[model samples]
Target: ENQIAFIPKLVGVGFFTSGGAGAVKAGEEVGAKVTYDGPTEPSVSGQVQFINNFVNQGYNALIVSSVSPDGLCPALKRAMERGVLVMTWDSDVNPDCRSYYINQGTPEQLGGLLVDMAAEGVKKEKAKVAFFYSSPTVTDQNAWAEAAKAKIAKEHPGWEIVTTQYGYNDAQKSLQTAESILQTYPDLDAIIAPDANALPAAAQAAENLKRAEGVTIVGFSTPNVMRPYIERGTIQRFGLWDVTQQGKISVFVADHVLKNGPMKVGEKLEIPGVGTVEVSANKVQGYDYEADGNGIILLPERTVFTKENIGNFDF
Candidate 1:
């Protein structure tokens, strides 16, 4: 049987595929054969077909970053029926169909962290903040934004969410949206961007129009793509779960399950050369959900990068 496989939400998107490649590294480290492939286009039908094909091939384990949360549920259910060990990360599928969800961190941890980061900047300037992300319906981005909003209200009641906008994950759309935010809110202090594709584009737009000096940008994303802005001082800081390790953890978890082993809550999975991960219950943004019976393999920690440290790492 094949050792491990990971299908991203789709290929070509740096967010998902970068993580997929990281998972492939995890697969290799554990003496497991890992396949990294998925729909080049983001489509539920394409993902379903791919999932079915993996099922028929008798893969021992599968990891997916779903395109649509519920659309892939039935296909996942089918994977479960065949006893294919399954889990998700980045963007998740339904909870009932998989063994675990690899998350960067919980809502409280990430939300509070994000709001605090942005609010710190706001407090310095005593200005309002706005939210600019990929889309309103983008499940993961919205969830993080909502959590950050709640945190801002409870923890930093002084800062207000002036407005929220979306770019549909298109660069042009994001550029325009940033411009609109700057134009609409002349006193805007910061913006939270949960989408990688949007964050730097937003930064670039601000730089082009000479607005970024007054408006900070922060949220969940990668460092490589945003390095230029950091170099130019367009973006001050951002947060993301370390995706390379995220990929490795899922593969190691699957390999563990393949040997008929299971992870118990509080158990420490000592991934080779990558440190340890403690298993926990499935909880997100104060929303409790049933575990995939596999619970959660919490990453060691989330990351906060700035101009000083952005050059210290690579993904």
Candidate 2:
């Protein structure tokens, strides 16, 4: 057995592909047979259905990044009960459904980073900013938005968060939303999209509207997707972590858990070539669940991609 499967939110986008690349590398390094597949489009039911099929098909380990928090829980929980090791990464399900989660960063960490990106990215003292994110139902992005909003209010008191918008993780819709927001707020100083899909599409909208110089579009997106904008001086800067590292760590955790069993509350795991992390309680993610078996591994660092830096990053 020991066939490990990783499922991303969608397969076509660069964010999941970059993360999936890291995961594949980890599987090869750890001597585990790991594979990843996801829906052609964003669909909660598709993910749930895949989980049920994976469980019955006898995959030994499952790693998932959910489209919805609660929609995939029942299937994941059942998979775990059947002795198929279950964990989530990128985006998470309910903690009760999975044994562990490989998180990119905590809400506070990502929130503060995103807020800082917006505050410094634009020059206007009372910058008119809008939040463009993945979806309303995506709990992780929702948490980051809440955290960013609070931070903006606390630290950047003068900045006006003009409005909030959701992209539903679709390219055309995100571009349209970006266009409408620009039209709606003619003097909009910035748009912060802490999402892979929204950020690029927002930049495209700015380029299309010839609003690139007047408005700053910034957020978490891979370098490959945003390099052209950086080259064109359309975006000054954006942010992301070592996206592939999360994949590597997630697979390393799954393999370890498979061999050694459920991680303890305070256990330290050394992932070869990726450094060590402590399996922490879900409360660290601001969740109520804190159990010995239910844990999270947080990626340690993040990055800001600037004009000078984008040259080096391909993904």
Candidate 3:
């Protein structure tokens, strides 16, 4: 029997909390035990502590949504050395530290999606945009931001990125940063915040400053968090893969890998509810790392929530 520790970026947040439900359900289906736990704050040290504890507790596998890509690598490497099956989901650590990563989508795809969302609000032929993300060093968000920049250059040549700000996954900090962006660039047409915390906080900043009249606030966030803003017309739409589905797929992958063996490149596995998933080579970002066993399984689809379809999703 395999036991997995399903760790998230933070506890008590609606996104991760909703995912926990799916993790537990997947465990029950696979006849493995899954424990959901993580830090209250999105901190690399906090996640490392949980990884250490899970390692000491002799868990068969560690399934995590990493807080930082490189920051959590050492601890995850140590866990792998201890014979724990380590894999990342939602966010990822260094490829060398984990056997596989369950990604929301290809970075290019998600980044383009964010750009598309912002472009929907473009009034002039040229648009001025800024990015608000969890942290400057965060792996997934950084990849998305870089991809978005590339996408803007290709698709919207007239669009200009003014600046990129980090919120450290704190609501107050995100709010202040959004306000600062507004003050610094009064003509800014759009603000794209891909982090869960930054999205709503940016919307709140727009609301508080009464600047929602013409500015576009969009990114990756859950429906529940963005519903109020959407209703008030402060936000038009945002995108995200299903958090519950992400949780279930991560737990399923952990249990399967632990029971069978490490995932192989170009191999496919059938998740009971998730359909067949392929293990493809890891998409290296701005990093130097390589491992044959390291692979990525992308989510089936990402959803864009507008008022029209927002009612269909709860998380």
Q: Please give the distance, in angstroms, between residue 217's alpha carbon in candidate 1 and its true position after superposition.
A: 1.4
lDDT of 3: 0.87
What is the lDDT, from 0 to 100, of the residue 157 in candidate 1? 73
How many steric overlaps are in each model, in order?
Answer: 0, 0, 0
lDDT of 2 by residue, 1-315 (tens): 368888988888998998889988888999988888888777898888888888889999999998888988888888988999999997888888888889988999999988887767686678789999889888689888899899889888889988999888899899999999999999999998998999999999999999988888889889999999989999889999898888999898999889888898788899878889888889888999876678888889889999888888888
Decreasing lDDT order of the candidates: 2, 3, 1
Query: Which stretches in model 2 have alpha-carbon errors above 4 Å?
Result: none
Query: Lowest-lDDT window of 10 residues in candidate 2?
Result: 117-126
For lDDT, the strongest prediction is 2
RMSD of each: 2.3, 1.2, 1.6
What digit string (tens of lDDT, one per residue) describes model 1 on residues 1-315? 355779876676667667877787777677789998888655778889888888888887788877676888888888888888888877666566677777777766777777877765666634588888876654566767888888777777777788988876566777888888888888788888777767877788788889877887776667878888888887788888678778877888788767856676566766787787777776643435654345666667887889879988776
- Comparing 2 and 3 on lDDT, the stronger one: 2
Model 3 CA lDDT for position 211? 86
Q: Is candidate 1 or candidate 2 better by TM-score?
A: 2
Model 1 TM-score relative to the real fold: 0.90
Clashing pairs in 3: none
Q: What local distance difference test score does each model get?
A: 0.76, 0.88, 0.87
User: 309 in model 3: Cα distance from truth in Å?
Assistant: 0.6
Backbone clashes in candidate 3 total 0
Clashes of 2: 0
Q: After superposition, how far is residue 25 of candidate 3 from its true place, in Å?
A: 1.6
